[PDB]
Swiss-Prot record:
Keywords: Aspartyl protease, Disulfide bond, Hydrolase, Protease, Signal, Zymogen
An example Gene Ontology biological process: proteolysis
Residues of the Peptidase A1 domain: 17-328
Ion transport recorded as keyword: no
Protein's UniProt name: Endothiapepsin
Residue spans crossing the bilayer: none
EC number: 3.4.23.22
Amino acid sequence: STGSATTTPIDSLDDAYITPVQIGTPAQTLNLDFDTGSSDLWVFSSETTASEVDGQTIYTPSKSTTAKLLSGATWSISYGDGSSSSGDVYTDTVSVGGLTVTGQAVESAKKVSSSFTEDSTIDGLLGLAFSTLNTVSPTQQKTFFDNAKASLDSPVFTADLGYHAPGTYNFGFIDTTAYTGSITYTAVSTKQGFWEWTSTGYAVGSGTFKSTSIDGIADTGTTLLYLPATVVSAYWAQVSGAKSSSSVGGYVFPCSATLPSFTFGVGSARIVIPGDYIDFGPISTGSSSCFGGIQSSAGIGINIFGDVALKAAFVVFNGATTPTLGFASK
């Protein structure tokens, strides 16, 4: 089997992407944030504290003939940005782009933090990291991909995120029309539960490539590119007036700037992030200070190849017995 679903930016900045997901019988379609940096499929629901729902579409398990309470199971998750959610668990039928999993754990939120409430466009998350990170207790649950894998034509999914445009998540096949040149594959460590890999270096604009190992994670659920302070300083030094602002929470730059590109290495291959992808717009409405899309990972504890990086590539998440990651230009 295979599946193919379009993923759409939630706003004009590509802050996140939503993908429609069918849950239950008859189908309830919710727009979920596919997150290769976590491993829980959770939804706003009929159980979510009413004051914490503001415009989201909810899953109502009592209206699904295939929903079953997973008795005694609870979940609770905290994300890198400080947001969180928690609740109980149902199993139900879940379909993405025509690919169906029966008995998928659907984590029903009883509580969500303010960042989730405030984002009316995101009805929940669909985790695509390794199932070892799943938070369900006392019986850990599998991701949608893990459950689907055996049925897939090939044990893979791909992320093809758009810049200010829709893109695609495919399951079970590689669309050879969706990228240019060849795919370069690179080793993955699953030791921390992430799609963790080592970039071979970087360049700023038309500058020379610096060969240096940068361990980080491929994370579709993180908006920006978070890299070591040395790398980030070298980038922003090429933008007149750019500076790190403790009050704003990162590097800012004059909105009048033309940003240089940023290149990262994948083995001997190179992925180029155009300068425009690194512009996250005014820090506050009408400001002439703009927020940068490359930020320091110092104090996160891990480097994160988030959407800014991934959307410059066609990315293969290879879940074969020894997982790997593939990157191609597009």
